[PDB]
Amino acid sequence: YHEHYMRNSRAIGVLWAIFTICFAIINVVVFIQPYWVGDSVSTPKPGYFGLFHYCVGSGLAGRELTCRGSFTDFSTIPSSAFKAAAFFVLLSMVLILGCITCFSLFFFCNTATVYKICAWMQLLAALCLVLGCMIFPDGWDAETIRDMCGAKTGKYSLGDCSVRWAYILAIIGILNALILSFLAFVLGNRQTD
Amino acid sequence: DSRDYSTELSVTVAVGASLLFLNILAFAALYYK
Amino acid sequence: CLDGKDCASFFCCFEDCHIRIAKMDSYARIFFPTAFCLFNLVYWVSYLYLG
Ligand SMILES: CCCCCCCC/C=C\CCCCCCCC(=O)O[C@H](COC(=O)CCCCCCCCCCCCCCC)COP(=O)(O)OC[C@@H](O)CO
Ligand SMILES: CCCCCCCCCCCC(=O)OC[C@H](COP(=O)([O-])O)OC(=O)CCCCCCCCCCC
Ligand SMILES: CC(C)CCC[C@@H](C)[C@H]1CC[C@H]2[C@@H]3CC=C4C[C@@H](O)CC[C@]4(C)[C@H]3CC[C@]12C
Ligand SMILES: CCCCCCCCCCCCCCCC(=O)O
Ligand SMILES: CCCCCCCCCC
Ligand SMILES: CCCCCCCCCC
Ligand SMILES: [Cl-]
């Protein structure tokens, strides 16, 4: 029974590491790509906006997407809520990359201790992502977002614009991060047996 | 460009469901004593 | 309390912990290159491909 126990624990640990890497990839992708919200058929102008970057059309029956915004210059970010959401998603990315670094501790430190360390780090990343996703809709009152979407758009209200793949992927990232946090906790308490 | 995002959200939700199902299978393998 | 373990023991670490402080060189030897490699990977990928 003990060898099956060890084999299952090792396999589930490897799978947990793989899914942690996948969630880190997801976190990086949702942080970078500006496809959180986007235009619709009834929108006055086309385009999209992410956490800090955003592209908007000129409005002459073509693409002509003028793009502006950069996290390395907070002056270009439309709103303080957008700044806070971008900062929180960045903090979540830093935390999950910190766990991926802490994978190295398995050589030396106790396996249960390392599992608990990444359990707490992944949980904190999940809270950071949750805070970012709650704070990001707060900034839809900004003048640029109102110009892009319409007058009906407002705080905590899509209006004419629609959620795109990055926002729902961030929600999926929250779910995956919380799940991996509990998985790490159970693995850490399982290694001691 | 058609400004309809249906297949995009569908594939995103499908990939997310696959990942989440794998992690729930991880919980299953753990909690199955 | 599905385990019924005390939550602080189940989740947190009051057991043992620091004591393992002399091995910080051994930890750093692997930690710092890994952190730098991860930083370089994310940085270059983000600036070259994703944006
Ligand atoms: C693009 C980004 C790529 C991500 C790159 C991530 C790489 C980051 C750097 C180093 C990883 C270090 C992993 C080393 C794990 C080595 C673990 C090991 O040696 O085997 C045993 C099992 O451990 C365990 O179950 C823990 C298992 C750890 C699993 C983590 C390593 C798997 C990485 C698989 C790569 C997948 C990539 C695919 C991405 C698409 C523990 O030993 P041991 O009993 O003697 O100790 C007992 C104690 O008394 C003293 O250590
Ligand atoms: C230039 C690179 C040189 C690599 C040399 C590889 C030697 C590998 C042998 C295994 C490591 C080992 O057991 O000895 C060194 C230390 C532990 O030493 P000790 O004081 O416990 O006896 O082990 C450690 O505590 C940390 C070992 C880290 C090895 C290298 C990590 C990757 C570095 C990336 C360089 C870019
Ligand atoms: C120390 C280890 C564990 C974590 C390292 C985290 C690294 C990968 C983080 C920290 C700060 C991050 C950067 C912060 C801001 C920006 C601007 C954005 O427009 C592109 C991504 C970019 C350039 C980020 C890339 C990833 C980054 C460099
Ligand atoms: C010894 C390990 C070091 C790990 C860090 C390696 C980072 C090297 C980066 C060198 C500059 C890369 C420039 C790339 C330009 C390009 O992609 O076209
Ligand atoms: C294919 C997109 C790759 C984005 C970078 C992923 C980095 C994962 C953490 C090192
Ligand atoms: C075990 C105590 C470690 C204290 C580290 C202090 C770091 C100071 C950074 C300014
Ligand atoms: Cl930027």
Closest residue in chain B to residue A162, using alpha carbons only: B5
Residues of B in contact with A175 (CB under 8 A): 16, 20
Of A12, A43, A168, the CB nearest to B30: A12
CB A101 within 8 A of CB A121: no
Of A63, A162, A169, the CB nearest to B12: A169
SS3 content of chain A, % helix, strand, coil (to 5): 65, 10, 25
Q: What would the two tokens of residue A157 be?
A: 């209200």
Q: How far apart are CA A46 and CA A162, in angstroms?
A: 12
- Give the CA radius of gyration of chain A: 20
Resolution of the model in angstroms = 2.6
CB B5 within 8 A of CB A162: yes
E strand or H helix that includes residue A116:
helix A111-135
Question: Which own/partner pairs from C28-33 qualify as long-range (CB within 8 Å, at least 24 positions apart)?
Answer: C30/A104, C30/A107, C31/A101, C31/A102, C31/A104, C31/A105
Name which residue sits closest to atom 27 of ligand 3, judged by CA.
C43
Atom of ligand 2 nearest to the CA of C37: 36
CA A71 to chain centre: 15
Q: Is C9 in the pocket of ligand 4 (CB under 6 A)?
A: no
Mutate to test the pocket of ligand 4, among C34, C39, C44 (most ligand atoms within 8 A of CB): C44
Closest residue in chain A to residue B32, using alpha carbons only: A8
